[PDB]
Amino acid sequence: AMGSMERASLIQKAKLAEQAERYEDMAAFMKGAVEKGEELSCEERNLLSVAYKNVVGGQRAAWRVLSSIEQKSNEEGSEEKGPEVREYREKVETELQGVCDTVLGLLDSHLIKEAGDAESRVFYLKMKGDYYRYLAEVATGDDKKRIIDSARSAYQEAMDISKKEMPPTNPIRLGLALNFSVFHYEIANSPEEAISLAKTTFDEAMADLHTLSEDSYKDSTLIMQLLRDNLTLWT
């Protein structure tokens, strides 16, 4: 995609789109950058993630609104409104699944296989778990189980690498554990696994904070607060 635009121009315009809060444009620019075939820098990986996180975030929010309306329409004492709510929820759902498939396609072709460093490989595998998790949020058919296992497998590989290759305060390691814990709680019906992972992650990060500079300390403690927020909600 965007095959006639220079890679550097795509990256520059992705940054401009973020400033203009044009996240669909941002995602299209970063998709074009990925398809140039070169590996992505730390900054460029962040741009890719931010763009699609915003796009799919809007779709998930819309899907939840429409799914809530649909479920109210299918209640005892309901006045038939027609197929419109279901049809429109299906439209948004199909568009969401398309975005997730696009991201998963980028990771599979060929971001993950060329990612050899821990920071890049864990980053992409965390993304893979995330976008399978988003697919799981809307899945109801004969593949909801397979989608959930695909998310778990990606998260698990990322966790194994991060525990071997990263310090316990590494922001990517912390964010991976945070999202994997959300997967356990919200998707896999394993709230005890979710709580245990968040607690162990928080405690081991705390014990490693003494090694950090003032700036890295702020990076890690911010994500630790998110783990604490979830623990407060779950316990």
């Binding site: 993630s49 975030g57 945070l178 999202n179 998110l226």
Partner: peptide, 9 residues
């Protein structure tokens, strides 16, 4: 229950 926001670079 919140995942990493990750909407701002």
């Amino acid at each position: 229950a919140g995942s990493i926001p990750g909407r701002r670079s």
